[PDB]
Amino acid sequence: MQIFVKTLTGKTITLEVEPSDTIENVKAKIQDKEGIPPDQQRLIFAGKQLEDGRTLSDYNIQKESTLHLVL
Amino acid sequence: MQIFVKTLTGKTITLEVEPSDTIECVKAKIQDKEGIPPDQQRLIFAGCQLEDGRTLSDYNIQKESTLHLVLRLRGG
Ligand SMILES: *SCC1=CC(C)(C)N(O)C1(C)C
Numbered sequence: 001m002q003i004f005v006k007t008l009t010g011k012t013i014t015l016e017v018e019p020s021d022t023i024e025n026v027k028a029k030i031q032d033k034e035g036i037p038p039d040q041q042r043l044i045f046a047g048k049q050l051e052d053g054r055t056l057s058d059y060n061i062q063k064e065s066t067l068h069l070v071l
Numbered sequence: 072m073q074i075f076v077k078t079l080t081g082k083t084i085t086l087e088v089e090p091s092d093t094i095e096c097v098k099a100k101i102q103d104k105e106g107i108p109p110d111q112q113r114l115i116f117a118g119c120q121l122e123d124g125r126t127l128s129d130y131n132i133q134k135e136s137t138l139h140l141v142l143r144l145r146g147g
């Protein structure tokens with residue numbers, strides 16, 4: 001499924017993920033495509049900070065959702 | 072040049088653009104200012120749907136023109 005990650009500089013990155021993926025995995029995909037180290041990433045969805053060991057399904061993130069990335 | 076983008080909820084947004092800008096760029100400016108994802112945006116001017124790779128000049132959009140923004144159905 002496609003999701004959008006909006007950064008604070010007005011760049012939005014699109015990622016292809018599965019609900020079963022962990023937050024740690026998502027962060028690794030973002031590092032791979034934009035080079036940001038996972039330790040600098042804070043991911044926010046529906047006002048919750050996402051935790052590394054949970055999966056996207058844990059948070060009910062559905063296709064075409066937008067997560068916010070704060071560094 | 073200033074252009075107006077009228078949405079279906081009666082909100083009009085003003086943008087500063089150049090005729091040389093592409094439609095893709097315009098959509099990115101709208102995302103930046105109102106948060107709507109480009110993939111949900113359908114831009115209409117003089118009864119044409121605007122295509123991403125063309126520029127505003129391609130369509131003869133002059134200053135103070137109004138484009139209409141229709142949003143693709145929610146989700147995908
Ligand atoms: S909208 C950015 C842009 C304009 C134009 C000069 C047509 N381009 O080649 C890019 C895509 C860089």
Ligand SMILES: *SCC1=CC(C)(C)N(O)C1(C)C
Binds near residue numbers: 118119120
């Ligand atoms: S821009 C003219 C146009 C718009 C749309 C309804 C997408 N069309 O099918 C044509 C190409 C007629």
